[PDB]
């Protein structure tokens, strides 16, 4: 119940929300159907429109008007935004040449530059260039301030997951808004765009920017706006708040536009109807900047122009129907569209089996436009699994397509020409970032980055301590003139042992064999040096990775590679090696095909054994340092050490073998040498974080050899590829991957063909940031480079996306 009988007199767009049943006057009262009876009359005035005209200049104040052009309007803070232009001979902000803002120029009583976030729904990154001719204000922000060619959203590329990621710095799996539609089985409640369940605080996790601010004594405008409040009135309201007394005035504000998403859905991303909505958005930006100039704030406020996600061409006719795949379509519930999420329709159905559903959806039609996954098998870069609201079965839908349960869902539930929600590396889903103001840099372009990084920066801009989040604080310091955040490298927690030769061959009973009894004070002194680390500077280019948890491990040196060997997991945490542009690939000699050699630096009790692999009929093994890239026949024997062996399903060995034999050399050729760090990952609870030993769900049968869920590689080279990887003076270039260690290649529909037709495609789908690998392993990479730490944090958040150019 609401008692709408109260009044909004002097309360229009009040900042504190009053408790029911008292009637509300804040910018969300409409959405809750709780506004006081006079809200429209008093707070949503429209009389005479939004612009001053010559004949209103000096007019006598009439409080009925939407905005004012009377002499007293500046001190009241409620002039139309073009007042000084029309009535006082001033220029529009967009018509002034841009002048660097070297320091904040703020009026007396301003304790810090305010922050204004101007957020636009469905603003595809390519609009900045393709629409630049009709968006002069936005183009001025862009060219004069700091901009990215694009900003990466989170998956799914839907509105509320991305807006709330922007507000919290968290992946959707962590903040809880994992889609625009959701079912939470613990609450037994559904979240919908339409209705009142979505207002319940329980859905919304983490700590959003407006709460972080308020707890630290920084006041915030209310970020949300009821759809019916026109944009002009949103802007006037913000400008009025900025004229409040110092002690009452917020320091952070948000404007939100439903455009261009609204029209994009109807007309497609570049439908000719899309020009007008872009013009109108620009006009709104102009109104803000003009109003700021009027208040003498245009060289004081930091403005962020940011989108949530892009927009792709999608039509009714590009829909896949689960009824064409499944026999039992009515036993399932499907969350449909640009992603699919499937669960059982009834928890009382004992014949529901996810394995049979997945199989019926796997590679069934030649040009099938979606692919099914158990969520723990989704690309780890999506970070989309660790939440009870994310159904076990997920469908990744190809760009330009939909999935639905049955055809009647699509006509009796054509219309639409655009949609979004696809994989967040897709070019059409990318969105925008521009920062302008004293704290941002001047005429600076920065590389694309992920929207999860922005919360930290918005906190830096306001002097706030960020709540714990998924950004890497410092990775965006290069966007800022001042207020950078200067982190220290984390402390190493475990120091390595450096074992020498401590065991005789006969102490081992691993059931291994090797034909290596073939064999000089020359290269015997020399191989002793190699085992003591004499070539380590070549193969460990950026320092040893630091182990950031308590464990027991050994550094092992070799001619061609160096490793950190875990006595707990019985395998390397990491193996590091450098392959020059000139390196030659060789074979595994016939007599060494099944060679595995005891490592006399490591006890039998801390070694794998070959008998376990013989007896486990499902499991084989591979090597981290590839025998194919040995520097010489004699060095190749090091590659067959038991301490370089890792457990691999035969199906996976196909992928790994092709990576090691073909691709590494290819990358060394293309990049002028590469440094490779490879290793296992264990994430059985799919939380994105290194498993402890007691979370491991599978071992090589009969043994304590844990089975990885994933294998990673970090491949580093010189950004200036005229320098070799091992003699690089400047910035680095990286690409990484986290490959699922699966017992089949069902993920790859063409896997019966030659690896040259499918393996690389798989690896591109599983591209990763170095930072993702850090979470998954508890390792810290790049500790000893000649680069600044912030630059290195940027490198660690890099994602190599293998998408074509944005714009063609
Ligand atoms: C991205 O960044 C985020 C944030 O930094 C990272 O997430 C953090 O990860 C930590 C490790 O997973 C985790 O720490 C745990 O906190 C538990 C208390 O959490 C509550 O309080 C906090 C603080 O305000 C709050 O933020 C939490 O919010 C979660 O849950 C609410 C609902 O209750 C949601 O609204 C919200 O969206 C959020 O959900 C998300 O996180 C939870 C996990 O907390 C997931 O389950 C959801 O799916 C969703 O992803 C909570 O309200 C604390 O209790 C934990 O302590 C246990 O584990 C420690 C380990 O040290 C152990 O020593 C203890 O004994 C204890 O175990 C006991 O409980 C077990 C389970 O019942 C039981 O098995 C044992 O036997 C014991 O009884 C733990 O310290 C932290 O909460 C989250 N924070 C957030 C905001 O998500 C995330 O890792 C980053 N991602 C990547 C890839 O890096
Ligand atoms: C509680 C609650 N339950 N439902 C609603 C509700 C109802 C109607 C609209 C909205 C909207 N919310 C957001 C969310 C995030 C940001 C944002 C943008 C950039 C950077 C940081 C940010 F936080 C701006 C927003 N403003 C809007 O107007 C859209 C929300 O609120
Ligand atoms: Ca884990
Ligand atoms: Cl109302
Ligand atoms: Na085997
Ligand atoms: Na296959
Ligand atoms: Zn939309």
PDB file of N, CA and C and ligand atoms in Angstrom, residues 29-30 33-35, ligand 4:
ATOM      1  N   UNK A  29      10.366   6.833  -8.173  1.00  0.00           N
ATOM      2  CA  UNK A  29       9.022   6.636  -7.624  1.00  0.00           C
ATOM      3  C   UNK A  29       8.040   6.085  -8.677  1.00  0.00           C
ATOM      4  N   UNK A  30       8.219   6.482  -9.934  1.00  0.00           N
ATOM      5  CA  UNK A  30       7.349   6.057 -11.034  1.00  0.00           C
ATOM      6  C   UNK A  30       7.391   4.543 -11.230  1.00  0.00           C
ATOM      7  N   UNK A  33       5.408   2.768  -8.804  1.00  0.00           N
ATOM      8  CA  UNK A  33       4.058   3.339  -8.661  1.00  0.00           C
ATOM      9  C   UNK A  33       3.810   3.860  -7.246  1.00  0.00           C
ATOM     10  N   UNK A  34       4.648   4.792  -6.806  1.00  0.00           N
ATOM     11  CA  UNK A  34       4.593   5.281  -5.441  1.00  0.00           C
ATOM     12  C   UNK A  34       4.796   6.788  -5.340  1.00  0.00           C
ATOM     13  N   UNK A  35       4.762   7.479  -6.471  1.00  0.00           N
ATOM     14  CA  UNK A  35       4.950   8.925  -6.459  1.00  0.00           C
ATOM     15  C   UNK A  35       3.795   9.607  -5.716  1.00  0.00           C
TER      16      UNK A  35
HETATM   17 CL1  LIG B   4       3.033   7.121  -9.748  1.00  0.00          CL
END
